[PDB]
Design a protein around this ligand. Structure first.
Ligand code: CA
Length: 569
């Protein structure tokens, strides 16, 4: 036998390799930062000094031959392609006529974006999140937001994964027209422009690569040499821990929807869809695509856009082409891919798409059954109600009446059930709809008792302006408030009212509120009871399940209520 081969660790990159090179110390165009390879370029050096090195080498991973070549002297550098991620016990075998000598096994790491090379994530979940007899056939979705790792300080390991089947990662931008991104203020529009340099219009990109894959997370064991970090490496590890959990990219949303309005041009769709396939090939932990176009026909962040005539068909065509692309990805990988979309449920949003035509391609519609009322104006109302509250005027629920300035109503009122029914009437199968629960409140200030026309119902009053508060109370933007912030700063431990706030519940609409008679502060939100009503309603209608916006704002209560209201028959 030859001399035993000896592995030069330094000359073998310390046996660490990766299918994806990721810029770690700069912010640039998407393709200056992200380079993917189907075959990792593996390089192993070994030494057989002042001895008999033999004629040929073989390299095994877990006893399986992956590489072979000739030996010439005491220094052999072996290169070769490997296309599957993982950890492997690697062995070097030198052979010649008289037999074969081996190195001692050493662990080689081939990183890939499926997490195949990672140990299951170490969770750090608030224990208020209870343990449940999960039913894997019911949808329990939620949104996790890329920027929530900053001030909100809520990271992938805080997610109650065991109580989720569906994680929607918000949000993936589309390069092109994005004037809406500017009202978000800050660095946001500039971050987009940087990521889209060298990127053709209507291609998807990562908006914040620092959060996505750059930030070193200690609890995830990240270090300087670590080839993938940030949120994505954590989601990858999370798939190893929870393999059946669907993690799906969410494209668009409120401020990143502007480019969807050009998808009336099929060539822009062709470029988009293709970029979505490369995205999913590049980022293998994702399980499909969710389209959050707000909204065909208009009505979203851009007062500027919206085509009620042509947007609907563009969206149907997009779902077909996205479905057909995912079909051929399923053929290439053997995986199953899901296609979903979050939609408005006001009647004026719903009528702009023939969801019967598009649903044939989709797995789930996430019905955004919330933001019915809020601080953009001074009309109190249930923002996330199952049914129409008593504060609504006659013929206002169904849109048959006229408003309090004698003007007529143009469609049914903003409730979840008005929304669902309109979708069922359209032909959408009930077992593809997912009902939305809020994990935040919307609220006003200055709804003093004396603004009320019905003294039992502050939803009957008038506001002076948006709710105000601090970051620490969960108020990240005026007139909006995390549920956990409502819990600990307005509800209290017994849910009976603290710091001047009362509790109330509109049993007819299935909608809670908290109300401060003195400040006139009014908050509408989803609570334990109201989510229970949504569970019952979902079951009664054969709805696929429930989903929530946004997980960082929950404290446990809402997701708990979601499981409990879904339990049983
Ligand atoms: Ca419309």
């Amino acid at each position: 036998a030859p001399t035993a081969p000896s592995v030069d660790m330094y000359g073998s990159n310390n046996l660490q390799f990766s299918k994806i090179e990721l810029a770690m110390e700069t912010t640039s165009g998407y393709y200056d930062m992200v380079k993917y390879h189907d075959q990792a370029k593996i390089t192993v050096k070994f030494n057989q000094w002042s001895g008999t090195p033999g004629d040929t080498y073989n390299i095994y991973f877990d006893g399986v031959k992956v590489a072979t070549g000739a030996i010439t002297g005491g220094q052999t550098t072996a290169t070769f392609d490997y296309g599957q991620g993982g950890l492997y016990q690697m062995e070097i075998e030198a052979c010649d006529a008289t037999g074969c000598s081996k190195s001692a096994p050493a662990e080689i790491t081939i990183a890939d974006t499926d997490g195949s090379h990672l140990k299951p994530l170490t969770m750090n979940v608030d224990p208020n999140n209870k343990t449940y007899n999960t039913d894997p056939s019911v949808v329990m979705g939620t949104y996790f937001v890329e920027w929530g790792i900053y001030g909100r300080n809520y990271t992938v390991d805080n997610m109650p994964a065991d109580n989720l089947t569906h994680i929607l990662y918000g949000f993936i931008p589309i390069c092109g027209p994005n004037e809406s991104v500017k009202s978000v203020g800050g660095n946001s529009f500039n971050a987009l422009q940087t990521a889209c340099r060298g990127v053709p219009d209507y291609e998807v990109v990562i908006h914040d690569p620092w959060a996505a894959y750059q930030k070193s997370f200690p609890q995830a064991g990240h270090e300087y040499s670590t080839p993938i970090k940030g949120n994505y490496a954590m989601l990858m590890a999370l798939k190893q821990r929870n393999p059946d959990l669907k993690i799906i990219p969410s494209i668009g949303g409120w401020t990143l929807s502007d480019p969807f309005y050009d998808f009336v041009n099929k060539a822009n769709r062709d470029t988009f869809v293709a970029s979505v396939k490369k995205f999913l090939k590049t980022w293998k932990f994702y399980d499909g695509v969710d389209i959050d176009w707000e909204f065909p026909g208009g009505g979203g962040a851009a007062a500027d856009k919206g085509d009620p005539v042509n947007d609907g068909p563009a969206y149907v065509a997009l779902m077909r082409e996205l479905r057909a692309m995912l079909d051929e990805l399923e053929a290439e990988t053997g995986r199953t891919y899901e296609l979903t979309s979050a939609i408005g449920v006001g009647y004026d949003k719903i009528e702009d798409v023939n969801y019967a035509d598009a649903v044939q391609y989709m797995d789930y519609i996430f019905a955004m059954t919330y933001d019915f009322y809020g601080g953009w104006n001074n009309v109190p109302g249930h923002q996330t109600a199952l049914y129409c509250g008593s504060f609504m005027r006659p013929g206002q629920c169904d849109g048959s009446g006229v408003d309090e300035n004698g003007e007529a109503y143009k469609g049914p009122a903003y409730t979840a059930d008005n929304g669902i029914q309109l979708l069922l009437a359209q032909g959408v199968p009930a077992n593809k709809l997912v009902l939305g629960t809020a994990m935040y409140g919307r609220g006003w200030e200055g709804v003093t008792p004396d603004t009320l026309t019905d003294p039992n119902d502050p939803m009957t009053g008038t506001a002076t302006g948006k709710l105000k508060g601090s970051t620490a109370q969960g108020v990240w933007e005026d007139g909006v408030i995390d549920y956990k912030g409502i819990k600990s700063f307005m509800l209290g431990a017994n849910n009976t009212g603290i710091n001047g706030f009362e509790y109330g519940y509109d049993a007819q609409a299935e909608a809670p509120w908290v109300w401060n008679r003195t400040t006139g502060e009014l908050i509408t939100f989803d609570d334990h009871r109201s989510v229970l009503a949504k569970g019952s309603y979902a079951k009664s209608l054969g709805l696929a399940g429930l989903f929530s916006w946004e997980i960082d704002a929950d404290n446990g209560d809402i997701l708990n209520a979601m499981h409990e209201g879904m339990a049983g028959g």
